[PDB]
Amino acid sequence: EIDISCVKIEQVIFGEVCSGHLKLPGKREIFVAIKTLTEKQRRDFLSEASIMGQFDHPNVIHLEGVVTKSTPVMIITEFMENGSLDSFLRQNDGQFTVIQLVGMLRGIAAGMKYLADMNYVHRDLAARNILVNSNLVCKVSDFPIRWTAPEAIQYRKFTSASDVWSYGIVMWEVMSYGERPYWDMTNQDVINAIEQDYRLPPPMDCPSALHQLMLDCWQKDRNHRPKFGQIVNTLDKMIRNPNSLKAM
After folding, report:
1. By residue range, what is the domain housing residue 38?
2. CB under 8 Å to 184, separation ≥6 — which residues?
3. Active-site residue numbers?
4. Least buried of 75, 140, 221, 222, by fewest C-beta within 10 Å?
5. Do both 48 and 101 map to the same domain?
6. Where does ATP bind?
7. Domain edge (last residue) among 63, 79, 95
């Protein structure tokens, strides 16, 4: 995809994850994220970019390209200054407004909408899998029992409704500034709590309209859960009317 002369490795922050610059002929020099790196492991490394390369959305990490003809093998994705959403929020506990947090969630749900629409089931949707930039824009990456829907744990049923459950856990993660879902419960304690109608309590200062949307995402019956298009509509109706976020 990309000629090695267009790539320039600056710093480090399967293999190693690096920072760098990308200047293609007849294009501006842009700051990028470059991942570097066994026959089976080389097939697994490049397969992520094969799935990723099929997507073109503002809330899905953009693949600038791949370098295969030279050593080492490189995955050149767009740069995300603020890294993973879970750690980013943990470092900024109580720093953003409710509107700013709902904006992040609307971004995640929109990228998830696009993926679902493309017949794709993520199966690993969580805040540690969401990347953030200087614009506070949230993008789905990585192409997890306490994020997995019950039906998917019980009879391995994975759909975009099981991704909606995962999205509900991300919603809770965002509103709690990246804390651990179910805190110090074991993976088995979570499974049994979830099967016996237990649902994560609303985080402190969390609006009623936001907690109810998480509850809909966590409906025992997957067909009763909202679709990603409905989630985006719900969060847009909240940004449009910020009074609906006043009641706790």
Report:
1. 1-79
2. none
3. 124
4. 221
5. no
6. 35
7. 79
